[PDB]
Design a protein around this nucleic acid. Sequence first.
RNA 1: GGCAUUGCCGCGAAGCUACCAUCCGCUGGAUUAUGGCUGAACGCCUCUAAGUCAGAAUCCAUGCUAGAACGCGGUGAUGCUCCACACAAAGAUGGAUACGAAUAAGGCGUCCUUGUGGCGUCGCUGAACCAUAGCAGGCUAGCAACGGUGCACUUGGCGGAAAGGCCUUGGGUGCUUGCUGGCGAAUUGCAAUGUCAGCGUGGGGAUAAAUCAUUUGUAUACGACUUAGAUGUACAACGGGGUAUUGUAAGCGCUGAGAUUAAGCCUUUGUUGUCUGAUUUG
Lengths: 336, 63
Amino acid sequence: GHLGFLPRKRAASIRARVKAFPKDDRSKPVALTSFLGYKAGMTTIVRDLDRPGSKFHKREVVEAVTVVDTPPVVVVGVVGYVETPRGLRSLTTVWAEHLSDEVKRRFYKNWYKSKKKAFTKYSAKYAQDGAGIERELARIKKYASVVRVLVHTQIRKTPLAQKKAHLAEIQLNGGSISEKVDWAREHFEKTVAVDSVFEQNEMIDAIAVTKGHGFEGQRGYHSRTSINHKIYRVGKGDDEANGATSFDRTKKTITPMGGFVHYGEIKNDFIMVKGCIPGNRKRIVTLRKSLYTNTSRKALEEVSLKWIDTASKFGKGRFQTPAEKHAFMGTLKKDL
Amino acid sequence: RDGVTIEFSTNVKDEIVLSGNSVEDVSQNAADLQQICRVRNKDIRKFLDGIYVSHKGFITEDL
RNA sequence: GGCAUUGCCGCGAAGCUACCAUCCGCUGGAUUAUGGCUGAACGCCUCUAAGUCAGAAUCCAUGCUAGAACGCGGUGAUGCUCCACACAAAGAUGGAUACGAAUAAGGCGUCCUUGUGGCGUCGCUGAACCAUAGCAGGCUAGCAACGGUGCACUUGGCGGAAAGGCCUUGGGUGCUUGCUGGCGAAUUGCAAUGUCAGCGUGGGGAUAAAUCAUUUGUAUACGACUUAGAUGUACAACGGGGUAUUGUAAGCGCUGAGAUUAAGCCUUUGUUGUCUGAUUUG
């Protein structure tokens, strides 16, 4: 096979890492340069599209897709990175002076036996007349060409409960670092939804480790990188009729009847994308937006759904909604 | 570049005058025009219609 | 039900698979031949000698994969206390003494308008420059001068390329060799440097951990890895239920009904039950 990927052995990390970022621009708003999802479930969608000159033009089309569960994510702290003729370097990590439980849980491998004394010095000491982050943060103001921001999920808000929340950082594409740093300073002890982050017809990336199988080198369980995935539908986790298209106009929960395979329903937004999102199921995945300007007739297009698959795909997928399901079944044995 | 005065010449159809100070630069971008017009792959003299530099000289006259 | 080596026809979730299904699969430089620009060599020219503008399926960046198990940064917790006993309360001996840029040229002072300016001058060694006397640097008298210098308090600002460095303000404290005083030194006997670079032990007490173990499954041959385990949507199970596998069940049409159902499906207003062992580290 390719000598691209060498050497052979496993990806040492359960969560992958982000090895690139979109360059930056000084004249933009402060922008959230990337985000990370949870792939939950595979499915298939029918739709039609506008692609002039292609043989599918104005022509009803069917293709499978991938869904990714996406909790709106909560932000604690900022670290600016100085640049040095070696590499970057951190200056100081900062936080929200109140942290959620789970991010506390990231700092203990044994939670129950521990004393939960973690932050008291740092998070308590900031309670005061101030200056807590003043000196350091203004230092970031002076130094630190590039700036990143701590981001961490709420997994109590996901049906798979490990109680423990991951940490990551994301850059900021704004400029004149003051309204960068102030930005997230304003966003300390806050959350940031996916609204202002992405929108449809935008190519991005989501990649992660892939499906550990076993030992016969060691096959799989690598974080590979698959770019160019067109988001068909930007979900909203409060949206009734999850799968409401430009066609269907009937009520369906994107979580099927009886639930997803190994899942409860969807409490937060999601991204449906074509093709494949690497890994095995139940996965935490990385999302990097284009790294550059891709603009072309290919990426400027506009998706038009027909029907989204809400069927329960355990066994052969058959019905869709329990109302229609129970109209076609009619009365069962004990029903009515 | 800078330092090039460009004009689409009137009193002569099908011609253009570029002038300036630096020999290097005026003939630099003149050569750069005649070589964006390269006709390969095909018959060489098929169209002797092409892009040429007709005049090489000064602005003044009588200097 | 069992054997008929997983009993055959038929059904099959799931797991695992298939160019037998689908997705997706980098953007800029540097270049060679080539075409030249400019212009000698060569009083013609010339892509070339100096200098040059484009350009390859290449090379390098751009993007991708890992991440030094003696590569490194950021921050989160407490390492503390007692007793017993051990170091100390790859080569020093004045000073590592800071523009930058050219070298067919530059500093320094200065002139005036502010220059690509004028004037002077410097270099041709750091052999320079500062510092330097006092028992290895004592104890004591003043003369001048308000210095220089130490130390500790101390203002203020700068330095994040490894900043941990530098300046600075303000008092006190000592010093003084800028000047002139007075007492001390031996006997180390004529050399054999003859001086002047808080700290771990091991056993308690306590702080925060981490590990084994246990459970789980995204992992897995062992490893190794990911969850949960402190009184809660904690966990575990039954059942409430929901999908769906299954093809009409003992038995008097009843019945697309039955049996199974997370052990690698799901939501759990209820029920029943559990909730802290050992080991080491800081």
